[PDB]
Amino acid sequence: ATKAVCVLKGDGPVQGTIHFEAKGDTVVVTGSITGLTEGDHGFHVHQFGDNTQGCTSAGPHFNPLSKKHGGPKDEERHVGDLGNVTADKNGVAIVDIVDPLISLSGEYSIIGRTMVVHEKPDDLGRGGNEESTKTGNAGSRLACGVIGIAK
Amino acid sequence: ATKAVCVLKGDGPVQGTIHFEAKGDTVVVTGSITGLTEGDHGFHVHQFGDNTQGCTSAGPHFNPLSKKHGGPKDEERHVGDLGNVTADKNGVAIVDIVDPLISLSGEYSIIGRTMVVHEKPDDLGRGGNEESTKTGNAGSRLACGVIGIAK
Ligand SMILES: [Cu+]
Ligand SMILES: [Cu+]
Ligand SMILES: [Zn+2]
Ligand SMILES: [Zn+2]
């Protein structure tokens, strides 16, 4: 794909639509997520596009390079590690990301994988417990969607 | 991918879980769809994995070869044309398909595309009208899901 889209859904108030575009050699990630608590929320590509057990069956973060969890600017990060989206007082987080590791084709393709927004801020792998190095302590998955080819 | 999965959801009673496995040069499609009226129901891969407008934003049957609509055993068929699933009196259709045209990788890859189950039987391009030649007269989209990568 050159364009992809993801509709985030869960059991609670959180919803969103995420768009992806292969621009130049990078992927531009845009959209919005609504119904969030104010502040940062972990935002990641999870390995499986599998919603059979809700957002749980999406598996861990997309990680073809077998690294520990990090922030999007880190060398040591998962390919899926897109950092945090930040909700305002109205519950709206505007997604605006350009990422060097994700792709919409080949080895790094996130098509058919899952976008997940989480309950808590991602500590970007700097929390100092084992959990930080896996998920950034971002906690439960509020909404997710399988990433699909868009027109 | 080598395995894929789709969760079909819509605005009514119909839902399902469809699994896909690359086997030799085919894709094995298994699963079930529940909440259907008894009888045949059109079942196709559609072009976009785009659920922003429910099943409508999936677009047409996946058709990279620009062919007319057919049944899965026809030479003249869309890549996405998987025929019908058949619901019993209890409303359960068991999906058991082997298809050589859809793929889980490359040009005919259905990863990131949308599986759709329909209101009416698919006449397999044999209804004698113009619509038959596009959609098999399978009617409304009861449920759909983006096909994602599975473990
Ligand atoms: Cu995540
Ligand atoms: Cu269809
Ligand atoms: Zn991670
Ligand atoms: Zn067709």
Swiss-Prot record, chains A, B:
Q: Which residues bind Zn(2+)?
A: 61, 69, 78, 81
* One Gene Ontology molecular-function label: superoxide dismutase activity
Name the GO terms of the biological process aspect: auditory receptor cell stereocilium organization; embryo implantation; glutathione metabolic process; heart contraction; hydrogen peroxide biosynthetic process; intracellular iron ion homeostasis; locomotory behavior; muscle cell cellular homeostasis
| Annotated Cu cation binding sites | 44, 46, 61, 118
Disulfide bond entries: 55-144
Q: Which CDD domains match?
A: Cu-Zn_Superoxide_Dismutase
Principal cellular location given in the protein's record: cytoplasm
Q: Does the keyword Phosphoprotein apply?
A: yes
Listed under catalytic activity are: 2 superoxide + 2 H(+) = H2O2 + O2
Q: How is it modified after translation?
A: Palmitoylation helps nuclear targeting and decreases catalytic activity. Succinylation, adjacent to copper catalytic site, probably inhibits activity. Desuccinylation by SIRT5 enhances activity.
Which residues does this entry mark as bearing N6-acetyllysine? Answer: 120, 134
* Lipidated residues (S-palmitoyl cysteine): 6
Work out whether the entry's keyword set contains Translocase. Answer: no
| Keywords from the named record | Acetylation, Antioxidant, Copper, Cytoplasm, Disulfide bond, Lipoprotein, Metal-binding, Nucleus, Oxidoreductase, Palmitate, Phosphoprotein, Zinc
Q: Name one GO cellular component term.
A: dendrite cytoplasm
Where are the N6-succinyllysine residues found in this chain?
A: 3, 9, 89, 120, 134
Q: Which residues carry this modification: Phosphoserine?
A: 103, 105
List of residues that carry N-acetylalanine: 1
Query: Per the record, a Pfam family?
Result: Sod_Cu
Q: Per the UniProt record, which EC number(s) apply here? A: 1.15.1.1
Q: Where in the cell is it found?
A: Cytoplasm; Nucleus
Q: Indicate the family of this protein.
A: Belongs to the Cu-Zn superoxide dismutase family.
Q: What else is known?
A: Chemical modification of Arg-141 reduces activity by 80-90%.
> What is said about its interaction partners and assembly?
Homodimer; non-disulfide-linked. Heterodimer with SOD1. The heterodimer CCS:SOD1 interacts with SLC31A1; this heterotrimer is Cu(1+)-mediated and its maintenance is regulated through SOD1 activation.
Q: What does this protein do?
A: Destroys radicals which are normally produced within the cells and which are toxic to biological systems.
Entry protein name: Superoxide dismutase [Cu-Zn]
Give the source species: Bos taurus
